Amino acid sequence: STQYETQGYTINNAGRRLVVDPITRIEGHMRCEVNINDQNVITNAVSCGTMFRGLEIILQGRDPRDAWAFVERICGVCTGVHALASVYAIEDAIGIKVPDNANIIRNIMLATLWCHDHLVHFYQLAGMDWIDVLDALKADPRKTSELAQSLSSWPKSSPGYFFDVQNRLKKFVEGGQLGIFRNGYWGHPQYKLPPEANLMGFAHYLEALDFQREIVKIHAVFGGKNPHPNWIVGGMPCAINIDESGAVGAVNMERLNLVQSIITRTADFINNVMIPDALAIGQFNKPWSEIGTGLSDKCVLSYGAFPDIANDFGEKSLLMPGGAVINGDFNNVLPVDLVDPQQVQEFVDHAWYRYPNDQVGRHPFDGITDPWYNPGDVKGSDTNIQQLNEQERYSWIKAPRWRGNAMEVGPLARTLIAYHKGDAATVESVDRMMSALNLPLSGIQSTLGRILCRAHEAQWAAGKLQYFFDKLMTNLKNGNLATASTEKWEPATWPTECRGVGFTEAPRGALGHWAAIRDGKIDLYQCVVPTTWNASPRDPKGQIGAYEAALMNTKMAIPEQPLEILRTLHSFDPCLACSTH
Amino acid sequence: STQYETQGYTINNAGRRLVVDPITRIEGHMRCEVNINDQNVITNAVSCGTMFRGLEIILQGRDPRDAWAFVERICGVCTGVHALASVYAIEDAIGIKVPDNANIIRNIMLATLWCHDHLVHFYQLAGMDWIDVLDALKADPRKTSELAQSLSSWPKSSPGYFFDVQNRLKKFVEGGQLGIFRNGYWGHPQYKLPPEANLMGFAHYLEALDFQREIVKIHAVFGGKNPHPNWIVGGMPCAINIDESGAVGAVNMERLNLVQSIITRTADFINNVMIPDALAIGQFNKPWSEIGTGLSDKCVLSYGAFPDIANDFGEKSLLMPGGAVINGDFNNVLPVDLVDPQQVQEFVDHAWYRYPNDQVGRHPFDGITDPWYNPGDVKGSDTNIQQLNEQERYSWIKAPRWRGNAMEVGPLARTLIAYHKGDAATVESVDRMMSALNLPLSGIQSTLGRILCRAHEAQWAAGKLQYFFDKLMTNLKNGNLATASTEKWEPATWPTECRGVGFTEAPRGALGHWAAIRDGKIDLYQCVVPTTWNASPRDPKGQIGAYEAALMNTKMAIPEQPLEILRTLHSFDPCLACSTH
Amino acid sequence: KPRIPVVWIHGLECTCCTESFIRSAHPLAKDVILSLISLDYDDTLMAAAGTQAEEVFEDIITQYNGKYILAVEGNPPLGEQGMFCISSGRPFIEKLKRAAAGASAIIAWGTCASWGCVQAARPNPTQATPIDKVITDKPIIKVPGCPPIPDVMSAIITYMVTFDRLPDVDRMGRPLMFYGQRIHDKCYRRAHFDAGEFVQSWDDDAARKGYCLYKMGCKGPTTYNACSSTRWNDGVSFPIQSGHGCLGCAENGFWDRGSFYSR
Amino acid sequence: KPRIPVVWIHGLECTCCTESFIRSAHPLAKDVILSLISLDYDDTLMAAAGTQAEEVFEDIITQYNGKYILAVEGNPPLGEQGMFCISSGRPFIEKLKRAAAGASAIIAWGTCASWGCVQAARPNPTQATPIDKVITDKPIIKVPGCPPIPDVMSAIITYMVTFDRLPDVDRMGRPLMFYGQRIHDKCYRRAHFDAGEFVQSWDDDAARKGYCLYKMGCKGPTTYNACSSTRWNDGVSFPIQSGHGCLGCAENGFWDRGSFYSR
Numbered sequence A, B: 001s002t003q004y005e006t007q008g009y010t011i012n013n014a015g016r017r018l019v020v021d022p023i024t025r026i027e028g029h030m031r032c033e034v035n036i037n038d039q040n041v042i043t044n045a046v047s048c049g050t051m052f053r054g055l056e057i058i059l060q061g062r063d064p065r066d067a068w069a070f071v072e073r074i075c076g077v078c079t080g081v082h083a084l085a086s087v088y089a090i091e092d093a094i095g096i097k098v099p100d101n102a103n104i105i106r107n108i109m110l111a112t113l114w115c116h117d118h119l120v121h122f123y124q125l126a127g128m129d130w131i132d133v134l135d136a137l138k139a140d141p142r143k144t145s146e147l148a149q150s151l152s153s154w155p156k157s158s159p160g161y162f163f164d165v166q167n168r169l170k171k172f173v174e175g176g177q178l179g180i181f182r183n184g185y186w187g188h189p190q191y192k193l194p195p196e197a198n199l200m201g202f203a204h205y206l207e208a209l210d211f212q213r214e215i216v217k218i219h220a221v222f223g224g225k226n227p228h229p230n231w232i233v234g235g236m237p238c239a240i241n242i243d244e245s246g247a248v249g250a251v252n253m254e255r256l257n258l259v260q261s262i263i264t265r266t267a268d269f270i271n272n273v274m275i276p277d278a279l280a281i282g283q284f285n286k287p288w289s290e291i292g293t294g295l296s297d298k299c300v301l302s303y304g305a306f307p308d309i310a311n312d313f314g315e316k317s318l319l320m321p322g323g324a325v326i327n328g329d330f331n332n333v334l335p336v337d338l339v340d341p342q343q344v345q346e347f348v349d350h351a352w353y354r355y356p357n358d359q360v361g362r363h364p365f366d367g368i369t370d371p372w373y374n375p376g377d378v379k380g381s382d383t384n385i386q387q388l389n390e391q392e393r394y395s396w397i398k399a400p401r402w403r404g405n406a407m408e409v410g411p412l413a414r415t416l417i418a419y420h421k422g423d424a425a426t427v428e429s430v431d432r433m434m435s436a437l438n439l440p441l442s443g444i445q446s447t448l449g450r451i452l453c454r455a456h457e458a459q460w461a462a463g464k465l466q467y468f469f470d471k472l473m474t475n476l477k478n479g480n481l482a483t484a485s486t487e488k489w490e491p492a493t494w495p496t497e498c499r500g501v502g503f504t505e506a507p508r509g510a511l512g513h514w515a516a517i518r519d520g521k522i523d524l525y526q527c528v529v530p531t532t533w534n535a536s537p538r539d540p541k542g543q544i545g546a547y548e549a550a551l552m553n554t555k556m557a558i559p560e561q562p563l564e565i566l567r568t569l570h571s572f573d574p575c576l577a578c579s580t581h
Numbered sequence C, D: 001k002p003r004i005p006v007v008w009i010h011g012l013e014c015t016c017c018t019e020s021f022i023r024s025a026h027p028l029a030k031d032v033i034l035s036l037i038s039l040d041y042d043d044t045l046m047a048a049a050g051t052q053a054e055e056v057f058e059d060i061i062t063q064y065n066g067k068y069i070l071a072v073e074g075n076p077p078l079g080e081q082g083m084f085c086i087s088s089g090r091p092f093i094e095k096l097k098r099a100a101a102g103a104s105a106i107i108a109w110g111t112c113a114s115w116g117c118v119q120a121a122r123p124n125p126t127q128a129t130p131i132d133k134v135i136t137d138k139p140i141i142k143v144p145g146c147p148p149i150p151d152v153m154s155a156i157i158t159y160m161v162t163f164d165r166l167p168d169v170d171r172m173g174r175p176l177m178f179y180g181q182r183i184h185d186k187c188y189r190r191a192h193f194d195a196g197e198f199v200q201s202w203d204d205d206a207a208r209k210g211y212c213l214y215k216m217g218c219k220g221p222t223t224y225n226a227c228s229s230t231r232w233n234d235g236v237s238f239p240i241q242s243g244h245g246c247l248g249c250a251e252n253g254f255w256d257r258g259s260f261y262s263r
C-alpha cells in the first residue's frame, strides 16, 4: 500500500477495496474503485473510463465540412454540442463569419440542449439517488397533494392524481417485475424524504419522462431531428422564408410558431416542476451541502458560451461567462486562452495512451491519440480486472489540466465563475436559492450544490431561449433572413494550412475542439470534453481530478451499497462517451 | 291576436313580442321570436332558420361516388356524419357490402365525432348559459381547488392553477376588450353557481378549447383531415399495411399507435372533466329539470346507429337503439321504416318552399326542394323583418313529421328510446345519474336533461371508441386487412335505376339521406337532418315542433335578456346549416 | 397593451372555417383569443345574442372604424333580394357591406369567402357570390381551402400581429407563403407518379404501399395549398397520405371540375 | 399478466439509440416501460449499480433463459483483447455473448449494432464489429439509423407485443414495415428532383423554396428508412425538411461513402 498528500487530501490505498463496475444512470461506461478505512470513510478514489472509440483518429483525412457530423456522434445525450464546437472550430480555422440568424439559431440549439439534458439528468439519472421510489407506496395521496401545492402553482397536484400515480406503481410492482427498480437501494438510511415527497418526486419522474420529448422539437425544426440534428460550416441549413412563394419548403411562420409553443411549455415545466423539486431535495438533504465539495472550493473552469454578438467570442459577447479560479482564490477569475500552450494540457502517464514523454502535458494542437491498453500490475489480468492499479495506467480518459492545475467544470463551476465576476442574475439566483434553504453560500460547493446549480441553469437557459427567439424574430421583422455564409464553402478558398479552436459550455462543462486543416483535409482534430476534466485520472505530480477529490473523505453507511458514491458521481452528470471519444 | 290549442299547449300571440336574431353559440343562422304574457311567461314561440344553400339541388346530376364530398359540406360542426350517411345511401341503392374493417373505421369516425362535437358543445356553445364567466373574478382560488378536488380525480386542480386562470381573466378584462364575453348576461339572477364553480367552469372551458383539437387526430389518420375528412363508396381509402414493404405509405403500427393514444386521452378528458362538470351544473340548477320539457314527454324519435355487424342495419346490429314513441306512451317503442311513405314526411305550408299541394307532406323519395321566399304579412318588409308571420311561411326549414306526429330527436330522445327498450347500460346510467341529483326520472325530460344526456353520450362514445379500435386490431391479428370493396365501383355494374336510404344518429339526432340513382347519376337527393326535426316550423294542423314546444310556458326574469330562451335552445345543440342544407 | 380588433361575420357557410381555426396547435386558438387579437364579434362563440350581440357589432365597428380586421366566413347570396341569408331581419349582404366599410382589411376565410365553395356549385340556387365580387374597395386576403389548414389560419394571424402588415399575395390574393406552390410539387408520393406507380383500384397492392393517386382522380397537380408540406391537424396527415386523392378544394370552382375520381 | 422481458445492453456507443427510444410519442416510453414490456436490465436507467446491477443481469438471464429479448445498443470492439469496452472488469464482448445465448431474439438498435456506425469508420481504431458478425446463431432484427426514428423503435416493440411475433424483414434483417422503401421514394422534394430544381449553395433562393438537396450531397436515393414518411419527433421534421441532405445514416458504411456534400 502507499500514502501521499495532494491538494489537501491524504491518498491512502491501504484497507478494504470497493469496486462499482458498472456505474449506472450515466451515459456510457465507467468503473469506480475506492478504499475505505475502518470508519467507513473513503481514503482513496479511482475514476476509470471503460470505453474508447477514437474519433480523433477517425477524423484524420476527412473534409472539414463533414467533421461536425462525425464528432456529433461522440455523444447522443449531449447531442448537438460537439457539432456546434466543430463548426466553430472549422470557421475559426478558415476565417468564416456566419450571419446573425445562424448564430441565434445555434444559441437556440444550445439552450434547448441545456434545458432537455438538465431535465432528464435530474429525474431519470440522478433522481433515484434521492427519491425512494418504493417508499412512495406508503404515501398518503392527500398529504402528497398538500405538499406539492405548498411548493408550486403547477396544476397537476390533485389527490386523485397522486392516487392514480401510486396505483400505477403498485400495479407495476405487484407482478414482481420491478424492472429498473429491481435490487435498488430502497430503505437505505440516507434516503430522507418523507413518503409524500417520494410520491411527489416519482410522479414528477414520470411527467418529466413524458415532457422531455417535447423540448427537442426545437432541434427538429432547425436541425431536422433529435437525437443528432444537422448543421453546416457557414451557419445552418434551415433556410428561412416568411412571406415568399415556397415558404412551405422552409422555416416559415408556422414553423416558428411551433418553436414558440415549445419554449413556453419548457420554461413552465422547468420553473414549476423541476425547480421546486430541486429545492425540496435540498430541504430534506441539507447535510449533502457539506459532502462532495472536492475541487469546487479550489479550482473551477469555464470557457464561456452563447456569443450574443455574432462571431465575437470575447467577454462582452458571451452570455455565459468564461474564466478560471485556482487556489481557492475566487477574487481572481483568470482569463482563459485556448491557444496558449501553457494553459490547457493533457497528461497520459495514468491513461491508456502513448506519448513521447508521459511526464509532460500536451496542448491539444500538439495532442496525440495513440491508444495503449496497458493496465500493468492489476489484481487479475489484462482481460479480467479485479482491481486497477492507480499507481500506473488506469483509464481511457486523458488527464487535462489548466496551467498544471486540476479543475472542476460544469454547472457548479460556471455558477461560481459568473457569481464571482458579478453577474447580477447569477448572484441573485444563488443568494435566493441558498437563502431559501437557510444555508451559507459555501453550501453550493458540494454534491447537493451541483444538483441545485444544474436546476438553476435549466431555468436560466429556458429564459435565454425566449431571448434568442425574440432576437431572431426582430431580425425577420427587419428583413434580415440570412442563415449561411458560403464564400469560403469551397476547399480551394481555404488556407493551405490553418488551425482553429471551437469552444462552448456543454451541459457538463467546458468543451473545446482543436482542429488543424492542411491541404483541404483534417490534419489533426483533438477534443477535450467536460467529463474528460471531471473524470480525469492522476498526473505526474499525483494530483487528483474532480471526481476523485469529491469522493475523498466521504462516509458510507453500508460499504457494500454505493449510494453515497453514486450520489456524488451522479451530481457531476458523467458522460463517459464524451470523456473518451 | 289569435289563440289555438295543439299538443296540450295554448298558442297565444297576444302580448309583448320579443325577437332574438341572431341566435349565437349555435352553428349557422337562426332567429327566434316569442310572445310573453303579463307574467313574463312565453305563450308563443317561433323557430326560424335564416339560411339556405340548396345542397339537394346541387347534388342533382353528380356521380353517386362523389356525393359524400358535397353533402359533407352540409356542416363543418357535425363534420363527417353527412359523408357517412351518403356512402350508406349510395351503398344501399347499388347493393354494396363493405369489408368489416371499413365498417369498424366508419364507427370510429362517428364515435370520434360524437366525442368531439358533444365536448365542444358543452363548453364553447352551451357553457356560458350556465357559467357566469365574469363572476369567476370574485372566486377564492383555494376554495376552487377544494371544489374541483371534491368532484374529480382530474389532475389540474391546484390553487395556483386556479389563481393563474383567474389572473389571466383579470388581465384580459383590464384591457377594456372583453371580446367574446362583451355584453353577455353576466349577473342575471338565473346564474346560480357560486364564484368557485364559475372559476372551475371557466378553467375547464379553456382546457376543453385546447383539448378538442386532439380528438380529431383520429379523423386525420383514417380520413386525411378534420374538418371534412375523406371517405369512399365501398369502404374507406385508408389502406392498411402492418408488416410489408411500403407500410410507411399506409395505416401502419405507428399510425394505429397514434390513434390509441388519442382514444385514451379523449376518454380521460370526458370522464374526469366534462362528466363532473355536467353533474355540478345539474346540482346547482335543479329547477331546470322542470323547464323545457316540450315534446320529450310526448314524442321522441331515433333511427339508431353504429352497426356492429358489417352491412347489417337491423336491431341486433345497431349499438345505438332506434325506435319511436308517440302520445306519451313510453311503454310502446315503435319500429321506424324510412322507406314507408306514411312515416317520415316533410311539410312546407309554413316554410319558404313550393309544393304542388302545400297541405300534404312528402316522403323524401317524393321530396321537392323549390325555394320560395315569401314571408307574407310581416311587420316590416320582405328585406327588413321586424316580426315574422308564423300564421304564414316563416322559415327555410321544412317541417318533418313521423306518421303525422311532431317529434323530438337527439341525445335525450335516444336516451329515452334506449331506456324504454330496456338497454341495461342506459337504465343504470340514467338511474344512477338522477339518483345522484335526488331528482325523479321525469326530471330527465327537460332542458337540464338534454345537457345531462349529451354529456353521458360523450362518455358512451369514448368507451365505444376503444371497443371499435380493439375490434380493428383483432381483425389485424387474424390477417384481415381489407378496407374497400370495389366489386361495384364502376358505373357499368350498377342498376340503371335504384334508390337507397342511408341513416345514422348524428350528434344532434336522427339523420337520413334518400338517394335515387338513374343512368349512373344522382336523380334525386333529399336530406332530413336532426335539426330539421327539432327546429321545424308548424304544419297544416298547426302542430309545433320540438323547439317551439320546449320554449312554450317558460318564465323569463328579464324579458330584454333572453337567457332562458338561449338555455333551452342551446340544450338542443342547434345546427342551422344542417337544418336547411 | 391592446390587441388588434377582429370582427368575424358568417354568411352562407357550414362553419368548417371556424372549426378549423379552433384546431390550431400553435398558437392555440385559446392564446390567439386571449393574447394575440381581440375577437370582438363572432356569432358562433360569443356570449351575447340578439340585440345584445348587435349592440356589440355596432359599437365595435363605430369605435374602431378604420382599425379592425374583418374576417369573413361563408358568402353572400344575391338571390331572393339577399334573404337566402338573413341577419337581424335583413339581408346578410347589408351586414357584410357595413362591416367591410369600417375595416382596415378583410380576410376571406376558406373557399366559401374566397370563391363560392359548395353552395356556388352548379346550379348555384342562391347566387352565392365570393366577397371580392361584392366588396371592391378594400384589401382582401383569400385563404382558400375547405376548410384551410388550422395552423395556416393561425400562422396568417400571427404574421399580421408580429409584422404589422398583410401577407404578400399571388395574383388571386392568396398568401404566397402557403399558396405559392402546388400540392403535387411538395407531395411525398411524387416518386411514384414519376415512376408510373399508381393505385388502380381501392385497397390494391399499390394503395397498401402508398403509391400515387393520380389515376384515382387526385387533383394535386392543379391545386395550390400547403397540405403536402405543413399537413393537417398538427402535422398528423393530409388527404393523400390517408389514401384519397386531393379534391382540389383550395381552387376556384373545384366542385364543378368533373368527378373527383376522373381526370 | 406478465410483460415480455427485455435485457438492454450497451457496447461502444454514444447512447443516441436510448435517447431516441425515450422520445417516443405513441406509445410514450413511460407506457412502454410500465405496461408493454419488462425492461429488466439497462445500465443507463436502472437504480442498481455495480454488484447490485450485475446480480440483476445474472438473475434475469438465468430465470428467463430462452424467454427474454436482448436489445443491443452499440457494438463490441475486438481490439486490445476486447478491452476497448470494459464491463464489470471484462471485455464487453463476453457479456454480449452471454446475454445473446439466453435470448429468444435480438434487436440490434441503430447503425452501431446493425453495421458499426462511427467507431467503425476508417480506420476503425478499436475493431468495432456489428453484432451479427459475433452472434451467428440467433434471430437478429436490425433497426438501423443514427439513431433510428423514435416512433419506429416503439412501433416495432408494439408489433412484437400485439402480434406475438418478430416483424418480417428484408434480406439484411431490417423490418419491411419501415425499411422497405427509400427515403427518396417518399420524399416531398421529389417534384423538384424530377424538374431539375436544386439547391446549389446554402441559403440560395432554391433553398428558401425547399428545392431538392441532391446537388448538396443528399444520399436519400440510396438510403432505406421511414424519415420522409413517418418523419421525426412526433411528425415534426426530418433532415431534408430542415434543409440538410440525407447523410445516408441508416446504411452500412455510410461514414465512408465519401463526403456528405459530394455525389
Ligand code: SF4
Pocket: C183, C184, C185, C187, C188, C189, C190, C191, C193, C211, C212, C213, C214, C218, C219, C220, C221, C240, C245, C246
Ligand atoms: S398523389 Fe396526387 S399530388 Fe401526390 S404525386 Fe400523385 S398526383 Fe401528385
Ligand code: SF4
Pocket: D183, D184, D185, D187, D188, D189, D190, D191, D193, D211, D212, D213, D214, D218, D219, D220, D221, D240, D245, D246
Ligand atoms: S432531397 Fe434527397 S431524397 Fe428528397 S428528392 Fe432530393 S435527392 Fe431525393
Ligand code: FCO
Pocket: A075, A078, A081, A082, A506, A507, A508, A509, A511, A529, A530, A531, A532, A574, A575, A578, A579
Ligand atoms: N455535456 C456534455 Fe458531453 C460531456 N462531458 C460534451 O461536450
Ligand code: FCO
Pocket: B075, B078, B081, B082, B506, B507, B508, B509, B511, B529, B530, B531, B532, B574, B575, B578, B579
Ligand atoms: N349532429 C348534427 Fe348536423 C344536425 N342537425 C347533422 O346530421
Ligand code: SF3
Pocket: B073, B076, C013, C014, C015, C016, C017, C018, C073, C074, C109, C110, C111, C112, C113, C117, C118, C145, C146, C147, C148
Ligand atoms: Fe369553410 S364554411 Fe364550410 S363549405 Fe367550403 S369553406 Fe365553406
Ligand code: SF3
Pocket: A073, A076, D013, D014, D015, D016, D017, D018, D073, D074, D109, D110, D111, D112, D113, D117, D118, D145, D146, D147
Ligand atoms: Fe445510436 S449509439 Fe449513437 S453512434 Fe450511430 S447508432 Fe450508435
Ligand code: F3S
Pocket: B225, C145, C146, C183, C223, C224, C225, C227, C228, C238, C239, C240, C245, C246, C247, C248, C249, C250
Ligand atoms: S382536397 Fe383540399 S385539404 Fe389539401 S390536399 Fe387537396 S387542397
Ligand code: F3S
Pocket: A225, D145, D146, D183, D223, D224, D225, D227, D228, D238, D239, D240, D245, D246, D247, D248, D249, D250
Ligand atoms: S441521415 Fe438518417 S435520419 Fe433519415 S433522412 Fe437520412 S436516414
Ligand SMILES: [Cl-]
Pocket: C008, C009, C010, C011, C043, C087, C095
Ligand atoms: Cl355575422
Ligand SMILES: [Cl-]
Pocket: C111, C115, C116, C117, C118, C120, C251, C252, C253, C254, C255
Ligand atoms: Cl368554388
Ligand SMILES: [Cl-]
Pocket: D008, D009, D010, D011, D043, D087, D095
Ligand atoms: Cl451492458
Ligand SMILES: [Cl-]
Pocket: D111, D115, D116, D117, D118, D120, D251, D252, D253, D254, D255
Ligand atoms: Cl456503418
Ligand SMILES: [Mg+2]
Pocket: A056, A398, A526, A527, A528, A529, A581
Ligand atoms: Mg481528446
Ligand SMILES: [Mg+2]
Pocket: B056, B398, B526, B527, B528, B529, B580, B581
Ligand atoms: Mg331536406
Ligand code: NI
Pocket: A027, A074, A075, A076, A077, A078, A079, A575, A576, A577, A578
Ligand atoms: Ni455527452
Ligand code: NI
Pocket: B027, B074, B075, B076, B077, B078, B079, B575, B576, B577, B578
Ligand atoms: Ni351540423
